[PDB]
Design a protein around this nucleic acid. Structure first.
Lengths: 142, 158, 263, 129
RNA sequence: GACGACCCAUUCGAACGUCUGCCCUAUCAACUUUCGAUGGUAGUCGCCGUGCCUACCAUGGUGACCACGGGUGACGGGGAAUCAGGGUUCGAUUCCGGAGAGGGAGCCUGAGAAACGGCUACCACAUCCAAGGAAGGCAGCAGGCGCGCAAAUUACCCACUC
RNA sequence: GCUGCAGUUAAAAAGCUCGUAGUUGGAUCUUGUGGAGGGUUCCCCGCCCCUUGCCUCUCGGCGCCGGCCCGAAGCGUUUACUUUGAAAAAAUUAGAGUGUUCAAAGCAGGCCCGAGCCGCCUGGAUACCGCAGCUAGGAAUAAUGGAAUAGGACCGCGGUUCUAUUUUGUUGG
């Protein structure tokens, strides 16, 4: 309680709630829209780009590994993202200065696992999925 | 009051004529005015002041031309200083289904005041009625004024 | 789109009491302009292939109307979307049959066949009295006929029997309590009962109570009341159910009581 | 102050019943409080009560048993419309088999089981069980 | 029988007007007025009512019960998804209403249009030409280019429904 | 977080007080008895003073024997509230009916006869539809409210001032 409970206090309630909703964390990203503007995506699930150069990222402690990322610039916003390559040895199935299709990690703007600075992964290298390259259901077209 | 002409154009009642026809004290009457009035109908009362009085106005419904038909509403005076009109207010309560509380909202509207009524003051109750447009912000006219129904303006000790 | 009047009418905004389907195409007939109100009409073609099933396609109905077997109010009509409404008589003279358009107790235009004797007149409401030039009075009716020189004692909300051939009314009723009435508009429809009471207000509508002989009281606006004959004495042959109107519980009970749904 | 008279009365009888007191002192009396306690007595949750008279606002003394459990006030006073009734009756009663939300109608003050048989809604006052 | 025409009524509407109902923002608190703001008197104009417009005259109108200003990945509603009760989010899209045909403006004909599968001009585009001139508007059905994460056949036919 | 959150120390009460708007606001102005519906008092007519508060009447029905009685007409200071009516486009939703071969759907369909039945029966319900506006009933609750250096009441009268056209067949005085 600690609040008015008149029968004519609809205004003082409905204007108060509309204000104290802005302090909520979820709401403040959704409704200012600065989230979208800042994102390298337009708010689309995927996006398409062109590879710039392979890189390797050294994982945050205590784990030690090299995580074989790429760096890609996008078509639809012309700006750059550092993107993970999943499975094993799929670095080889990516070849520089071609198109790729990117996709978010699965934690909505926040780095996943022990790798820092990488919020994206890669799905298609030339209309052929990393899954099908790895399994052998399709082959890289050269 | 005896003179009500002051305009560029002559002020008169339409639907009245002035004769030159003979009388034994002529020419040609004894004030040259047979007064015009009409009833509103509906069950609202005609005032004495109109039938007695002398004024030229066309936006009043007692002497002028304008019908009252459709809605009927009330209000209260809040302000006036305008020429042959006033401002009034309508307090009411708006409900919200998300809560179960009410809250206050008001609108203000102007409405034309007859030269017949000459006893109005701020805070007097008023009743009004729907009409065809008369002006940009006038859609109504007064039909009746009433006061001494809540906080009197006078007291008896005579 | 609003640079002029529309001419199509859909099926899914069509007035619902013509009992249309929705797996035939987008359009529905549309009543053409005429004497009865668009909502209150039953277009011709719906009586002739969506009721009695003489025809099976709309082109077939056009082939009936062209040979001129159809009449309405003793004159010949030949449209497929003529707008006939309440209290008219259709007359097919190639079958020897005559119909009447009247309201069912569930509020939809039924098939009410009648004697040729009854089919020589209809009941018409008075709506307006209007003095024309040179001091002649007039009537105006809901079927929109102007009958000149009426005797002065007939007033509005009365009803008059009209001879289809000649105009020139045969009888009339003067509207009052204790006269038998049918409802024609409003949320009540087709109910029959005596007038019982009226109520007047100054402008903004007024209502008219009704009570029937089965002990139910209901009310309706003034302009949805229609007189059918003197108290407990109809001057028309009424369709079955007699405007009493049951509830759904009782109506269910009848079907399972006779245990009948075929014969 | 004391903006709600009914609200201050019932809290006393609540506190008192917990300790086990079988006589109390409630002030100020109002006619509204009398008809309240009348309904609470008929059903048998409380016993006979004595109105002391002054020339101020009166004082009341009550005889009660351990049968009462909790009587509440509902502030502000909402409306009920005999379909809103059921929504209320769920929330304020621990059971479907006992307890009585009270209210006032144009047909006078009464419990909800009775109000439904008069076929009239009204303004709700409190509850008890 | 067919046709035409005048006026009144009727039907289909149309147009103005009443009351009530609307998403975010105060790091938007005063705004509006002779480039009419509010009102009065007379006139002009218009299908009619009306500062719609003009002359003369008055000095008002609105606001902390949120005006005014700004924002909206806002066409509105009938509805849709989830849900014990109370809610929250969505609604470009088959019904109903509105607005618009590259952007602007003007206009003819007609009962009805500020029409664009009508016209006239500018601005932005783009085509043919003997270089003198001429012609154009797929947010109609298919189809193509471009854009992008993202979306079909240059098919058959008036038999049904109208 | 209205239903339904929290503020000593976990995030958190303005240093303190005054103050207009807003919100909220004490008590106070009526109970018993026969008939009728349900118990063993208690919840449509009346009675103590009241009982749907009054009259005044006059025009158009009901009466009873010129004379008399009672329904409709103004309304009970105003609202909210509550209860009933009127009024609401369809599709969708809830929901009645029907063996789509079952279902999603759909609005249909069902009966007896060789060839004589040249026909018969029946459906296409119903609910809800925020607000705001219209109608009637209730009168507790909450606002608002009647004469206080009077005016309320009765065909009580005066003085003063103004005035109606209806009828004496018509028109003037």
């Amino acid at each position: 309680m600690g609040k008015c409970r008149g029968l004519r206090t609809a205004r003082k309630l409905r204007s108060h709630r509309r204000d104290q909703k802005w302090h909520d964390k979820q709401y403040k990203k959704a409704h200012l829209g600065t989230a979208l503007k800042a994102n390298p995506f337009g708010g689309a699930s995927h996006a398409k780009g062109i590879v710039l150069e392979k890189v390797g990222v050294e994982a945050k402690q205590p784990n030690s590994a090299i995580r074989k990322c790429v760096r890609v610039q996008l078509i639809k916003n012309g700006k750059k993202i550092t993107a993970f390559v999943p499975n094993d040895g799929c670095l080889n199935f990516i070849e520089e200065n071609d198109e790729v299709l990117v996709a978010g990690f699965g934690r909505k703007g926040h780095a996943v696992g022990d790798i820092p600075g990488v919020r994206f992964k890669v799905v298609k290298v030339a209309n052929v999925s990393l899954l099908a390259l790895y399994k052998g259901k399709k082959e890289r077209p050269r | 009051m005896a003179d009500i002409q002051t305009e560029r154009a002559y002020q008169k009642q339409p639907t009245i004529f002035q004769n030159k026809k003979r009388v034994l004290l002529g020419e040609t009457g004894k004030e040259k005015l047979p007064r015009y009035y009409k009833n509103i109908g509906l069950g609202f009362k005609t005032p004495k002041e109109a039938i007695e009085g002398t004024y030229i106005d066309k936006k009043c419904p007692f002497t002028g031309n304008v019908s009252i038909r459709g809605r009927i509403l009330s209000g209260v005076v809040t302000k006036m200083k305008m020429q042959r009109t006033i401002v009034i207010r309508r307090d009411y309560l708006h409900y919200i289904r998300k809560y179960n509380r009410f809250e206050k909202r008001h609108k203000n509207m102007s409405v034309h005041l007859s030269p017949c009524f000459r006893d109005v003051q701020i805070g007097d109750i008023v009743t009004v009625g729907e009409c065809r447009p008369l002006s940009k912000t006038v859609r109504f006219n007064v039909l009746k004024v009433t006061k001494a129904a809540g906080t009197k303006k006078q007291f008896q000790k005579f | 789109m609003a640079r002029g009047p529309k001419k199509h009418l859909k099926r899914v905004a069509a007035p619902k009491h013509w009992m249309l389907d929705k797996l035939t195409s987008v359009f529905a007939p549309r009543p053409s302009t005429g004497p009865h109100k668009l909502r209150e009409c039953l277009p011709l073609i719906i009586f002739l292939r969506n009721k009695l099933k003489y025809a099976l396609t709309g082109d077939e109905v056009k082939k009936i109307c062209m040979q001129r077997f159809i009449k309405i109010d003793g004159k010949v009509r030949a449209d497929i979307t003529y707008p006939a409404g309440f209290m008219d008589v259709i007359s097919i003279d190639k079958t020897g049959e005559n119909f009447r358009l009247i309201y069912d107790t569930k509020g939809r235009f039924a098939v009410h066949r009648i004697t040729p004797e009854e089919a020589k007149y209809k009941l018409c409401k008075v709506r307006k009295i209007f003095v024309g030039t040179k001091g002649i009075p007039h009537l105006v009716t809901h079927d929109a006929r102007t009958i000149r020189y009426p005797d002065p004692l007939i007033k509005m909300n009365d009803t008059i029997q009209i001879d289809l051939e000649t105009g020139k009314i045969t009888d009339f009723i003067k509207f009052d309590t204790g006269n038998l009435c049918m409802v024609t508009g409003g949320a009540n429809l087709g109910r029959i009962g005596v007038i019982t009471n009226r109520e007047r207000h100054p402008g903004s509508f007024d209502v008219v109570h009704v009570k029937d002989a089965n002990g139910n009281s209901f009310a309706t606006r003034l302009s949805n009341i229609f007189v059918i004959g003197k108290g407990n004495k109809p001057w028309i042959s009424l369709p079955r159910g007699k405007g009493i109107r049951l509830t759904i519980a009782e109506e269910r009970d009848k079907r399972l009581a006779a245990k009948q749904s075929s014969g | 102050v004391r903006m709600n008279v009914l609200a201050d009365a019932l809290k006393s009888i609540n506190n008192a019943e917990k300790r086990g007191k079988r006589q109390v002192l409630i002030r100020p009396c109002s006619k509204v409080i009398v008809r309240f306690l009348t309904v609470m007595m008929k059903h048998g949750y409380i016993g006979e009560f004595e109105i002391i008279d002054d020339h101020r606002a009166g004082k009341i003394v009550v005889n009660l048993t351990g049968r009462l459990n909790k009587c509440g006030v509902i502030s502000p006073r909402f409306d009920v419309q005999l379909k809103d009734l059921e929504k209320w009756q769920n929330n304020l009663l621990p059971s479907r088999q006992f307890g009585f939300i009270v209210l006032t109608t144009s047909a006078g003050i009464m419990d909800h089981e009775e109000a439904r048989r008069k076929h009239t809604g009204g303004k709700i006052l409190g509850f008890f069980f």
